Amino acid sequence: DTVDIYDDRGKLLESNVDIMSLAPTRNAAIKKIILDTKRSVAVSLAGIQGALASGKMGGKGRQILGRGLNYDLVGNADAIAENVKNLVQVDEGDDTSVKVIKGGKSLLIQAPSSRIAAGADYMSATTVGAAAVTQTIIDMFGTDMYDAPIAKSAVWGSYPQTMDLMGGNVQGVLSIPQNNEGLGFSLRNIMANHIAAITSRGAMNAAALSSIYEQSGIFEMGGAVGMFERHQLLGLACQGLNANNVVYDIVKENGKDGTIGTVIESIVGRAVEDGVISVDKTAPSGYKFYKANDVPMWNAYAAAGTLAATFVNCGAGRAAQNVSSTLLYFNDILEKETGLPGCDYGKVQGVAVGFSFFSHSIYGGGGPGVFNGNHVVTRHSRGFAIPCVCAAVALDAGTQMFTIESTSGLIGDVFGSIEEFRQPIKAVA
Amino acid sequence: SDTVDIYDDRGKLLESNVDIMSLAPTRNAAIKKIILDTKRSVAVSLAGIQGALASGKMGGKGRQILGRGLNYDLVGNADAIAENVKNLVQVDEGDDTSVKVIKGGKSLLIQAPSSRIAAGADYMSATTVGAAAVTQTIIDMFGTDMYDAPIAKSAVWGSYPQTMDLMGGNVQGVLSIPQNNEGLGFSLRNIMANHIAAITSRGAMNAAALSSIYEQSGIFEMGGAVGMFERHQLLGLACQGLNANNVVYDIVKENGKDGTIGTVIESIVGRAVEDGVISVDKTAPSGYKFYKANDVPMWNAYAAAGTLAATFVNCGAGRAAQNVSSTLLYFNDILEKETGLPGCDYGKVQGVAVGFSFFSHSIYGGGGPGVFNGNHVVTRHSRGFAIPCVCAAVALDAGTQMFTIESTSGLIGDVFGSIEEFRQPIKAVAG
Amino acid sequence: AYEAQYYPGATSVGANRRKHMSGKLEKLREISDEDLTAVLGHRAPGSDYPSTHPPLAEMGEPACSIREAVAATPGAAAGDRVRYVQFADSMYNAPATPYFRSYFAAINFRGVDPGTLSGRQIVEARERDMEQCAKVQMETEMTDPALAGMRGATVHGHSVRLQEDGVMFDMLDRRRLEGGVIIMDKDQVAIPLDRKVNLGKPMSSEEAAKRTTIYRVDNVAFRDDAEVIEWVHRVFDQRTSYGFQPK
Amino acid sequence: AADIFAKFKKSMEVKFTQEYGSNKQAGGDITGKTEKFLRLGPEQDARKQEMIKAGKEIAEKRGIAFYNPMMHMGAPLGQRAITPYTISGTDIVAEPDDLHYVNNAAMQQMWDDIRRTCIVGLDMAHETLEKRLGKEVTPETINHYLETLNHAMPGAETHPALVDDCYVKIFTGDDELADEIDKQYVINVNKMFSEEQAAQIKASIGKTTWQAIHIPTIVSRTTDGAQTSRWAAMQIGMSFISAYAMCAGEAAVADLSFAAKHAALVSMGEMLPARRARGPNEPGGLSFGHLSDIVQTSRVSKDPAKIALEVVGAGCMLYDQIWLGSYMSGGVGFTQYATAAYTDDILDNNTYYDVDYINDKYNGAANLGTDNKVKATLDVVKDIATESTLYGIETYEKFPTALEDHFGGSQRATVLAAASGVACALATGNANAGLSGWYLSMYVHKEAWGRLGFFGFDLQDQCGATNVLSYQGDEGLPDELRGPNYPNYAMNVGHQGGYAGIAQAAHSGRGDAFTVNPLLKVCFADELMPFNFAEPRREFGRGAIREFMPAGERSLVIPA
Amino acid sequence: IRRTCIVGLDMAHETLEKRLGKEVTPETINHYLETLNHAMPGAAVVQEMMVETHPALVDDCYVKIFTGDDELADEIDKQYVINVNKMFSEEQAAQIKASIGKTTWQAIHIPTIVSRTTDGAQTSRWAAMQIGMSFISAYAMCAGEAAVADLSFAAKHAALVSMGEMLPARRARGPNEPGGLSFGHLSDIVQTSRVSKDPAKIALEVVGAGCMLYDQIWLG
Amino acid sequence: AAHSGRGDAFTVNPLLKVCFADELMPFNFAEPRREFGRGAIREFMPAGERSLVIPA
Ligand code: F43
Numbered sequence A: 001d002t003v004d005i006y007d008d009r010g011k012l013l014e015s016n017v018d019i020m021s022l023a024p025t026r027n028a029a030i031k032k033i034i035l036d037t038k039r040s041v042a043v044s045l046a047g048i049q050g051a052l053a054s055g056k057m058g059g060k061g062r063q064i065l066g067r068g069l070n071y072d073l074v075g076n077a078d079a080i081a082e083n084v085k086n087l088v089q090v091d092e093g094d095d096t097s098v099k100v101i102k103g104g105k106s107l108l109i110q111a112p113s114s115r116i117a118a119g120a121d122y123m124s125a126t127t128v129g130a131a132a133v134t135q136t137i138i139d140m141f142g143t144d145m146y147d148a149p150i151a152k153s154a155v156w157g158s159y160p161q162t163m164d165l166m167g168g169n170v171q172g173v174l175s176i177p178q179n180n181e182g183l184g185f186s187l188r189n190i191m192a193n194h195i196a197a198i199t200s201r202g203a204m205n206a207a208a209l210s211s212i213y214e215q216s217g218i219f220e221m222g223g224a225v226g227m228f229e230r231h232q233l234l235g236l237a238c239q240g241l242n243a244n245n246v247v248y249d250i251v252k253e254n255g256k257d258g259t260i261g262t263v264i265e266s267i268v269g270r271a272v273e274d275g276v277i278s279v280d281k282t283a284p285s286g287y288k289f290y291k292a293n294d295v296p297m298w299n300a301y302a303a304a305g306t307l308a309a310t311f312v313n314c315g316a317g318r319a320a321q322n323v324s325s326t327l328l329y330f331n332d333i334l335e336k337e338t339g340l341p342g343c344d345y346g347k348v349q350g351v352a353v354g355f356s357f358f359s360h361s362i363y364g365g366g367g368p369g370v371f372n373g374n375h376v377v378t379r380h381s382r383g384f385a386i387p388c389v390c391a392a393v394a395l396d397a398g399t400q401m402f403t404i405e406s407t408s409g410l411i412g413d414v415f416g417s418i419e420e421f422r423q424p425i426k427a428v429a
Numbered sequence B: 001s002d003t004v005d006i007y008d009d010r011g012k013l014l015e016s017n018v019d020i021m022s023l024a025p026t027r028n029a030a031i032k033k034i035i036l037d038t039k040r041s042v043a044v045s046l047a048g049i050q051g052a053l054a055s056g057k058m059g060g061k062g063r064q065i066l067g068r069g070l071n072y073d074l075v076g077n078a079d080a081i082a083e084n085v086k087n088l089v090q091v092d093e094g095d096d097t098s099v100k101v102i103k104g105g106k107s108l109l110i111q112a113p114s115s116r117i118a119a120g121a122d123y124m125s126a127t128t129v130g131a132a133a134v135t136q137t138i139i140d141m142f143g144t145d146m147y148d149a150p151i152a153k154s155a156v157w158g159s160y161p162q163t164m165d166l167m168g169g170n171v172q173g174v175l176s177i178p179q180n181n182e183g184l185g186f187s188l189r190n191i192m193a194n195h196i197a198a199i200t201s202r203g204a205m206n207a208a209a210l211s212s213i214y215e216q217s218g219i220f221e222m223g224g225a226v227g228m229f230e231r232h233q234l235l236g237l238a239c240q241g242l243n244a245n246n247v248v249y250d251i252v253k254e255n256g257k258d259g260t261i262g263t264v265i266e267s268i269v270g271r272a273v274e275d276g277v278i279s280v281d282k283t284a285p286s287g288y289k290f291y292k293a294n295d296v297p298m299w300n301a302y303a304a305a306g307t308l309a310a311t312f313v314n315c316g317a318g319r320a321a322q323n324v325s326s327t328l329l330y331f332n333d334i335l336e337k338e339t340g341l342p343g344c345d346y347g348k349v350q351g352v353a354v355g356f357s358f359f360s361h362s363i364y365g366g367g368g369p370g371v372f373n374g375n376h377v378v379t380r381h382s383r384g385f386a387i388p389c390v391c392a393a394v395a396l397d398a399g400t401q402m403f404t405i406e407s408t409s410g411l412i413g414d415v416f417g418s419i420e421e422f423r424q425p426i427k428a429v430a431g
Numbered sequence C: 001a002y003e004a005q006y007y008p009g010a011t012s013v014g015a016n017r018r019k020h021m022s023g024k025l026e027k028l029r030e031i032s033d034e035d036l037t038a039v040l041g042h043r044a045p046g047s048d049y050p051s052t053h054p055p056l057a058e059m060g061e062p063a064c065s066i067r068e069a070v071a072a073t074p075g076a077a078a079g080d081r082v083r084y085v086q087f088a089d090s091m092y093n094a095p096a097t098p099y100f101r102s103y104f105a106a107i108n109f110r111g112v113d114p115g116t117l118s119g120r121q122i123v124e125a126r127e128r129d130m131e132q133c134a135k136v137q138m139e140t141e142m143t144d145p146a147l148a149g150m151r152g153a154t155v156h157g158h159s160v161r162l163q164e165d166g167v168m169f170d171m172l173d174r175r176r177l178e179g180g181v182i183i184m185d186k187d188q189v190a191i192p193l194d195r196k197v198n199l200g201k202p203m204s205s206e207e208a209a210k211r212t213t214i215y216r217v218d219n220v221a222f223r224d225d226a227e228v229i230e231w232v233h234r235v236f237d238q239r240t241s242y243g244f245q246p247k
Numbered sequence D: 001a002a003d004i005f006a007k008f009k010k011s012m013e014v015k016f017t018q019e020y021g022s023n024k025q026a027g028g029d030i031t032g033k034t035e036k037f038l039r040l041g042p043e044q045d046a047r048k049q050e051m052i053k054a055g056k057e058i059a060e061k062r063g064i065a066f067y068n069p070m071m072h073m074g075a076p077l078g079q080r081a082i083t084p085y086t087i088s089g090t091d092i093v094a095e096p097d098d099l100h101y102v103n104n105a106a107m108q109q110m111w112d113d114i115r116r117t118c119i120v121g122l123d124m125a126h127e128t129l130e131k132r133l134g135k136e137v138t139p140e141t142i143n144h145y146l147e148t149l150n151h152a153m154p155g156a157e158t159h160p161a162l163v164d165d166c167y168v169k170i171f172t173g174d175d176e177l178a179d180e181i182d183k184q185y186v187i188n189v190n191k192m193f194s195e196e197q198a199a200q201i202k203a204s205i206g207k208t209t210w211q212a213i214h215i216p217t218i219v220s221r222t223t224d225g226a227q228t229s230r231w232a233a234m235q236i237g238m239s240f241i242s243a244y245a246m247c248a249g250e251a252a253v254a255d256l257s258f259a260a261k262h263a264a265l266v267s268m269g270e271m272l273p274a275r276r277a278r279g280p281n282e283p284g285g286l287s288f289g290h291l292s293d294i295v296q297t298s299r300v301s302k303d304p305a306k307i308a309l310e311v312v313g314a315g316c317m318l319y320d321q322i323w324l325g326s327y328m329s330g331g332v333g334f335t336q337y338a339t340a341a342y343t344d345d346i347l348d349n350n351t352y353y354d355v356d357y358i359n360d361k362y363n364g365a366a367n368l369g370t371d372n373k374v375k376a377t378l379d380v381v382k383d384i385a386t387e388s389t390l391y392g393i394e395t396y397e398k399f400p401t402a403l404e405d406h407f408g409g410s411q412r413a414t415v416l417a418a419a420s421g422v423a424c425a426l427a428t429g430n431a432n433a434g435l436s437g438w439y440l441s442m443y444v445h446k447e448a449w450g451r452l453g454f455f456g457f458d459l460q461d462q463c464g465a466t467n468v469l470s471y472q473g474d475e476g477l478p479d480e481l482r483g484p485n486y487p488n489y490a491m492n493v494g495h496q497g498g499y500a501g502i503a504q505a506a507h508s509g510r511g512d513a514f515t516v517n518p519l520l521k522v523c524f525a526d527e528l529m530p531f532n533f534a535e536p537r538r539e540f541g542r543g544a545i546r547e548f549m550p551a552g553e554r555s556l557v558i559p560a
Numbered sequence E: 001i002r003r004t005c006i007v008g009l010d011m012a013h014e015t016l017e018k019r020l021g022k023e024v025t026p027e028t029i030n031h032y033l034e035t036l037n038h039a040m041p042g043a044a045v046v047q048e049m050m051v052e053t054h055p056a057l058v059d060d061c062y063v064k065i066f067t068g069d070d071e072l073a074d075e076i077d078k079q080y081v082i083n084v085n086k087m088f089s090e091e092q093a094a095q096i097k098a099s100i101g102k103t104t105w106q107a108i109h110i111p112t113i114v115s116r117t118t119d120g121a122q123t124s125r126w127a128a129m130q131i132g133m134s135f136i137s138a139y140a141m142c143a144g145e146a147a148v149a150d151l152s153f154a155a156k157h158a159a160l161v162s163m164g165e166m167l168p169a170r171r172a173r174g175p176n177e178p179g180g181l182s183f184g185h186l187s188d189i190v191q192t193s194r195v196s197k198d199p200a201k202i203a204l205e206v207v208g209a210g211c212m213l214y215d216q217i218w219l220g
Numbered sequence F: 001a002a003h004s005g006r007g008d009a010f011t012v013n014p015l016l017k018v019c020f021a022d023e024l025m026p027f028n029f030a031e032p033r034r035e036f037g038r039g040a041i042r043e044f045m046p047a048g049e050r051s052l053v054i055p056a
């Protein structure tokens, strides 16, 4: 199983790269992306100063009256960065990097990888960053002994009274491990707006990075053992990483006047030509049931077609709303028109059903940008349906209410400064 | 730069002038290897899997699926099962994966590679991958029809994903699921005193050293050691757990035959005064001599060393493991009475000692000290200065507890005691 | 290229289903654009389309390869609101069904958001695109005024026994018979129109049954269609097997 | 079956062709395809008139808008007639309103009984006493200790009359031990079950002794379900200390405190993940096997179809009306997604027809036994499910009233899929066979009618077929173990009720004593509970008539 | 304390004004609040042939709006408005209006029986469902469309103020329980600081209520 | 007490402070201890009673 990986402009990145070489547990760039997501955290200096001044800290609506501290954190953000780097870093000169992002309002704290190798999970980054910021505040701004709690909770929110830092001003790409729906789901717990914002709204970059996270979290959860390793790697290569440029070829050929039906025709034509499926039986009415000679390859083709169709539908409409219907109906009409199961064997189709329901009804969910791989609505597809959601959100034009800015302004501003995230396909290739 | 030198279990010198900065969880190579081995190692109960398949007693406490029994000779084929599972869990032919058949094929020991850990956010990759590998191997090798696949799967993944964890499954590591931690960074704790006593073969000082290694690693993970608190925790760990300067072995030796907690307090305060750690800040009219700490982190380290020494004395004297819940409390309390300074951890050790006491000396006894760990609501308070004492106590018991350390931790003892860094924590930490 | 086949089934229901999925539908009536806007109810008839955001040209776009490769719909270049058209179809031999309305909308129109339920089928897009889709669905044989209709809320009546008049039940009574022609006098959410919209003469029951896409033992038994049953069985067998093992 | 088909027809007659209240539906043809809608408004129900009057009166009394049917958009509720519901397998006629769990006392009492119940293992406590305390336990000592537990558990500062529903019983797999113990505290497996059922129960629990603990219902209502375990543990510790003459305060007795409090404690449910965070003893963690076992229909009946159907009825109610209808969702409720599977006998008619079909094709494979059962293959599942689904569709298309009754497609899809899955699990004795038949029924329904169900009813049914036989980590468990916390099943209605009945059928058709847990079958095998788990569907009907008296009412400590 | 929840009206209003292009005037808010007070106790407002919770058993359920906008509170029907100026002293009222801003909030109190038959996680779900349905009924928008989801997501998360947060896994209990109710929220629930000026009586009342609520109920 | 002596309107959350300034509550949150006293003497009427559906 050898594919080519094509970047979002349709150019050739690397030729003949073996599929197994591209696995989460083997690829160096994917491992680096995982490590950076684990260690990097973002601090809102503006929010810290606002909470200190107004006492608005500890969650939604909370405000302590009469204990306001008036510190110019934003003005002295450079010295704060230097001291936070001094505190966080384990040894001098290691991988610890702290940058001041966007004119002092926010910080980027990337704790050293030693703090990751010397702990069970990624929360060391968040806790050490919050501790460093709190210590630097108390140090350089001369906070009284009895004002320490206020400076602490202007960074830590309500922790430990709450499980997470509710109302805090330090946060990372991944939520706390206590929020997982299962074993290994932590890497899947990244909302769609985060991936849309990180790649600066680039559809085949948001899709690539979201699929990288999804497949990392599915390898972690024992989803790729034996033949399933190949099963998932084929899907990742074909859908997420633009294997052999199929997705972008389909996008170009069905862009100007395409629909879901034309993309279905494109996928079935490419499958029949490449030999992935061939006519097994012909019914008396002339309908030709097809049989999948290469079952994981057919699943990969269905996933690539799903992503391409989401591109076409949500780019013709310029609304991230249509992603749920695209994911449902591409697979559904593919089953109807070929006689074969859709991508991930009805799993992607069912995830699209639930995700279209919950984004179109009174029962919760929300816009397509609040769904992640850990969501109970969308935790079912084995890495083939959330990439489409993230790509759709990146491909919206001001239609959503809970936009990328509203939910992930800090995340976008801070993590859009890493090249391994703005260009995930180039990194992986 | 605070520098001590480490004295091994028998009081010998290990290496001279170890910087306590090179002794933290985030810098020591032995500690990092211990953490990785704890994260990746998992033990599979082949006998339990076979019994679940034959009887249908799978999925949890009381469950039994009737009429769907599969009879597979799992224990008889254990070498083949282990070989196939090693094939399935690997990432490359020749990585640090290892599958060993422990105790005659009744159980398996599978340690996932470091690549599975580095490419996942936390430690459950080893558990899930090992369980999936075993289930795949059973399905492949014993010819399970696809309508019996659920039974073969749930004989391993007991009642999961319905339950958050493998409730009733026969694949278990040492750490609990990431959801079941007490808080941020608490995961690397949660290894009960019985396991540490078993791993070190009930060597009280070795057990205390290893338990303190885990507890301080959890502290560093939580972000409770940054800068001056990093110095605080490093000094405390080096003095108490690692027997730095032989200050705890000497105290135990001096109160060897006839010595109570009070004599330990006198010895520790004498050493603190002699070393200049504390001085006489005042003198009340009654002749009392209020003391002031010239080095508060170092005085806390001395208090922790004294607490460990007092637990050694008052639990080896009676050869009971139930004397920690009173030793840690009353030693620190009497120490503050004697010197006018605060106890170990500024009272947090005494508070967690009260926790041990009421949770183990009461009608709400949740079990003896063998169940104590740093990842519990009752025992999470002290910053890693109390739990080493509990582990030392359980290592110093004479069999007065209902649960023998063997009966609850034999497999963990076999799996980890075979590793040098787990039987001799201090020598590896000393490097 | 690859010629679509769209569905298995040799009966008349299979033929109608292929018609609806491929959209090769026959004109059956005319609805004036002002009438269409009035019945939809998202804007005053013959008035400029509102905008939820500025135009694509006015505010520029990020550097997506998909944006530059995919041509934005005419209703998205103008930043129109994402409005809807919803339909309720009768089980008693209506000429359309939810999933096949959805297949129509998905195969034949760009940038739509067809959603399918048992009792209602909603299509969402920009206002102009939804106007096009509603125009096609209203002027063809896909929609029977007696056995269908726009309903933005209280869609109950798809499975209820028809009226003696021959028209589906409507709680809000949006449209009904008047002088032999189904006259619609409320928008699709029961906000009355100032005008009466004449949607024509409803089809005869024999005609609707001759051009319905719902299997029924009365008209076309699903049990007697071996090809669709075989399609179900094949897809299900493959799903189950490859859920066990992808090989 | 013809008899069940007859009762289905009679239910349609009493529902549509007969007038209820003042809807003026008297007359008609239940095989007819037309009707005239009178549009009488919500005032046709009479009970709805009661609700309107009460809401208006409360609106004047309190001072803010409370309940005005005119604020229904368009026209008020009931533009088509308000026809009643008949509980499957019985003749009590129920109004739709009375089947909303808020309005049904028995419906509430069911969950208040599963929630407040716990079972604590007792061998380890006696073993610790014997070995490490010297106080040998003799059946006289157990009698005294259980007497002490039985009223201390109610609290003894709890009100003597406010906690009358708070008692403790024991059941043991040791036949000779249960003989001496005072029978007021013993659940006797040998005389509550048949010989073979009791044989399997004893074989599965071994020689072990267990306690069935039921804390007061008012305590369960006030707090959550996680208070049950702690209340039971505290009362157990108090009873051990006060019944065995043991000092409280020494260290060694703490080992017994652990052993008797929570070392062998089996919870009804377990923990849930974050979005639905909840603790033990909530419906999201209650397995399908555990619900199959809480229903004592297996213990008291030999008919497998009746057992599976009764489990389906109770299940839908617990998992749809309470769990998904209230906890995860709230609002008006989901009573009519649930009444489909335990009202009007459509499900019973379909399932009895499937029993006849299987017994005719597979030599009585659907009869009780364990050797006649056909091995589960794709051919058998395809055959049984498709025929079942085709018959159910033909019945909806042949009786327009049955179609109007299950007006929303979700009810029809649930009924068809439940019948198909129950039939497949009966024929094959494999619960996952029933699951795969369920999903094939959903596919046949979708392809036949062009519509399946609500927007997201097909989530676990598209994910359904492929995950039934997978052995991957988060996909696949035997059904008996599955539950509302299963990843596919966590958030959708109309399924989880039928899933439990599927697992019960796989073991009901074999004459099995229990589905997944014997401790639950024996724990709830006690006719002292205020709820009758032997037949739950008859219990919901009893509540809907205002003839069910629950526990946890505070009338004694409240002004009158 | 358990059945009570607060949901903001300004984010839903932004959603309605953007996605649908509606105008949110005081008369539409009067109509919507009347609709909501109908629908919150468990009644239907959109579709037909369904049950509804009996008004006698859920009579302790209602929804009120308090706003830091003085005018918007002024022309809204004064049966659904918690008037800050009337209820609070002018200094405290000024502090509150400064703290919240010119934003409107809903004070939802779902039925007691629903909270007793369920847990404290019940409240936000029930409130969000009925708020979404009331929006749908009162603002003439489609039963199912993306704007409805945004309102649901706003009510359920984006603008929800829970009495308590959710507890960690070890404590086998959930949201809006006594263990998530921090000390600040329990102080704010007790309304002695609004009614009296004795600074010691306020603290003593908070102690008296907190001792009960925590020790007797939460810890048992 | 940290804020009451300062005469502050709210402790940490004004939304909760204004949300419970309603007189329709069956429980008087102005005098909590007095409410406990009333409850202890069988003179407090709570909601949630099911006497309508329960048999007499
Ligand atoms: C606003 C929604 C979208 C949403 O997220 N939920 C709604 C409404 C909601 C409300 C209706 C109460 C009210 O009026 O305030 C409740 C009761 C949930 C709640 N808040 O308790 C509900 N639906 Ni709905 N909902 C149902 C159903 C349905 C069926 C109804 C089809 C038909 O022809 O009537 C359709 C979807 C489908 O096509 O399957 C449906 C849609 C819809 N459902 C459309 C309203 C449709 C309309 O305007 O007519 N429900 C059903 O399938 C039957 C049972 C009924 C549920 C009430 C009960 O069983 O207790 C109710 C379940």
Ligand SMILES: C[C@@H](OP(=O)(O)O)[C@H](NC(=O)CCCCCCS)C(=O)O
Binding pocket: A358, A363, A364, A365, A366, A376, A377, D275, D276, D324, D328, D329, D456, D490, D491, D492, D493, E125, E153, E156
């Ligand atoms: C999805 C999720 O919603 P949120 O993610 O919270 O918006 C979840 N809903 C429930 O799982 C579904 C309840 C409604 C079910 C309606 C019939 S499918 C919940 O309440 O947390």
Ligand SMILES: O=S(=O)(O)CCS
Binding pocket: A357, A360, A361, C117, D453, D454, D455, D456, E144
């Ligand atoms: O209208 S929806 O199908 O989304 C919900 C019905 S319960």
